[PDB]
Write a protein that binds this ligand. Structure first.
Ligand SMILES: NC(=O)c1ccc[n+]([C@@H]2O[C@H](COP(=O)([O-])OP(=O)(O)OC[C@H]3O[C@@H](n4cnc5c(N)ncnc54)[C@H](O)[C@@H]3O)[C@@H](O)[C@H]2O)c1
Ligand SMILES: N[C@@H](Cc1ccc(O)cc1)C(=O)O
Ligand SMILES: N[C@@H](Cc1ccc(O)cc1)C(=O)O
Lengths: 365, 365
């Protein structure tokens, strides 16, 4: 009945189209600058039609989704502003940054058009539409950044359009999105590339260095092999946030130099202990975690089948697990399994079920 | 038959004792400051006999292995020097740093006792003798740092003692060892802890960082969960090398600040391109100075029993899992479920076992 236009029919666009058709009877018209991709999307029933005219498809659309790169989306929003769109249209994107997009949207569309920025924290550009899946974004954070004027009810309509994603939707202001993604995603990319560059500089002086960088060092710097073109565009789009963070990092490295140079075993130990305790605690369940969840800690032995037996007991009781991880918080073979549940009642059933099987459990550690 | 003394019967010590007994009929006498550890080592046939006094066992030893922490080894070498050791004895350690150890050894033993420093580059999610394995060091670098006047014949005898490790032995000078390990192993550990500290500081201001930091960013900082006691001793023992590297790092971050602040897309792209090309050149699926993650990513649907089925498949193949997690922040990472293994062989078997049951899996490059 309703019409969706999808601009950029890759892995991300295609997976959104599949998530949408999962929960909605809609015609999806695909548009892509790479003709072969959209053709392939129509061949795979990811889209129902290929856009003959971009204007024509857009002017009949209830929903317009940009899955194009941020720089391309910015350019097309101008075109979108010159069209006569439906009164009820929702427009959204999938960009890794939101500041520049939302600046352009506010300048072009304010009050008239429901533009809501988006950022699904799953997927890649390493494959195309051939590997698209309705569940690509299942239990991924999906950040939405409504323009200042967009009523709460339009944001709920978009979450409804996208309910088939099974994403944890978070509504943030634009600055907050770029601030938080600057710290947890963009900044590590700068440091990963810097670590590789420092090893590369010394590799000239000793040939052993390239060989000893296999394994863990390669694993730690994984994100340094991501697209230089894409990451240079993100650094440009989030430049001011990253400049503030780099200046604070340099100050932190100068304090770390003073700690190391002082040789005080106490101070250095505290520095490693603080980092270990914070990292081990992630994610830190708080009051304001929008997806509210409930933790059970279980003492488990490091042996074949330990996790198999725990998960088998919870599955037989029809308890869904939202997350789990192992903490090395004991002395020998004993480890702690942290299990997260959506509902308090699931945690309670899990505690009872494991208690009857003679497991030690706790609700705080 | 020949006599081995093992001083410190933990993970690394115990694994060496098992690798020794694999290829040699010997009596191994265990000595440990924690009585229950060496008792447990005897219970597990890691050692043949226990000593609570060093002198008698050491004076009849053909081989003495220090697998105590480097600060403790340094202290015990004095005691060893006061004993009347065999003419043919070889003495070795397993310390992550070699400068301080070799300084103490050269002061105590020069031209008299065959002391050869050692550093097997292998790790574990665990400490303690119950996690010791004959195969811990297979295809790992094992660095030997002989004192200046140790006959090369004694280095060959030691490689023969330890042939059951299946390690790649390298003979290095002491300074070279601490310089190379400073760059490829110690310095990254400092930066991983620094990154955690910076994110922790901002999590105070926006508690959303405590939630969105559990996925991707956890990857570069995984090593920050390693032993603070061990890493504070390594930073102490390698202080001067790490001071020089921190000052270089600060200078590199200042140049990176100038690049980012100039906003030039070309220059920033070149910076990421150089890092990507160097990282892509590093060896594939090989052991280096930092233990590799051995991560397998698995596409699973959010259903009751999804983890039960995956863990059951791996347990039926007798594969031990070190860790697992559901990723909620996973841009550039296909596969919602991440599973970690002790070694590449386990990950390879896990990929085959899950493949046979029609699970899609992914490994990073
Ligand atoms: N753990 C690794 O990943 C790794 C890697 C390479 C090298 N190493 C080196 O090996 C050393 C041993 O590490 P591990 O991982 O086997 O630790 P561990 O805790 O498993 O074993 C160390 C053992 O030494 C004993 N010990 C401590 N002080 C002693 C003393 N004064 N006298 C006698 N025994 C004493 C402890 O009780 C323990 O059993 C580390 O300090 C490190 O320098 C470790
Ligand atoms: N090795 C266990 C899981 C586990 C891992 C580490 C531990 O410390 C404890 C348990 C399994 O395969 O099920
Ligand atoms: N709910 C699943 C685990 C799971 C959670 C989230 C996912 O996206 C996928 C799987 C179980 O109980 O086994």
């Amino acid at each position: 009945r309703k019409k969706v236009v999808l601009i950029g029919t890759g892995l991300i666009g295609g997976s959104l189209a599949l998530a949408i058709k999962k929960d909605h009877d809609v015609t999806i018209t695909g548009y892509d600058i790479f003709q072969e991709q959209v053709e392939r999307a129509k061949e795979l029933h990811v889209v129902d039609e290929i856009a003959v005219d971009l204007q024509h498809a857009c002017e009949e659309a209830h929903l317009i989704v940009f899955a194009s790169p941020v720089e391309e989306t910015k350019k097309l929003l101008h075109k979108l502003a010159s069209f006569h769109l439906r009164e009820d249209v929702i427009v959204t994107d999938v960009g890794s940054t939101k500041g520049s997009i939302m600046n352009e949207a506010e300048a072009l569309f304010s009050k008239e058009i429901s533009f809501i920025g988006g950022h699904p924290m799953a997927g890649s550009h390493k494959t195309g539409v051939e590997s698209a899946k309705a569940h690509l974004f299942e239990n991924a954070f999906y950040i939405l950044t409504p323009m200042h004027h967009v009523p709460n009810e339009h944001v709920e309509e978009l979450k409804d359009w996208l309910k088939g994603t099974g994403s944890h939707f978070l509504v943030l202001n634009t600055e907050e999105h770029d601030y938080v993604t600057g710290i947890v995603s963009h900044f590590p990319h700068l440091i990963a590339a810097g670590l590789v560059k420092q090893v590369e500089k010394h590799a000239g002086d000793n040939p052993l260095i390239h060989q000893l960088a296999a394994g863990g060092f390669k694993d730690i710097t994984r994100i340094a092999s991501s697209s230089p073109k894409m990451w240079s565009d993100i650094v440009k789009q989030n430049r001011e946030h990253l400049m503030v963070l780099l200046k604070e990092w340099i100050s932190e490295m100068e304090d770390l130099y003073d700690t190391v140079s002082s040789g005080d075993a106490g101070e250095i130990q505290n520095y490693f202990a603080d980092a270990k305790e914070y990292r081990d605690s992630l994610p830190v369940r708080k009051r304001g975690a929008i997806p509210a969840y409930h933790d059970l800690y279980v003492d488990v032995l490091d042996k074949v089948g330990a996790l198999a037996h725990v998960t088998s007991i919870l599955a037989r009781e029809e308890i869904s697990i939202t997350n789990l991880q192992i903490l090395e918080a004991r002395e020998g073979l004993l480890g702690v399994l942290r299990i997260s549940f959506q509902r308090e009642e699931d945690r309670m059933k899990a505690k009872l079920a494991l208690g009857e099987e003679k497991y030690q459990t706790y609700e705080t550690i």
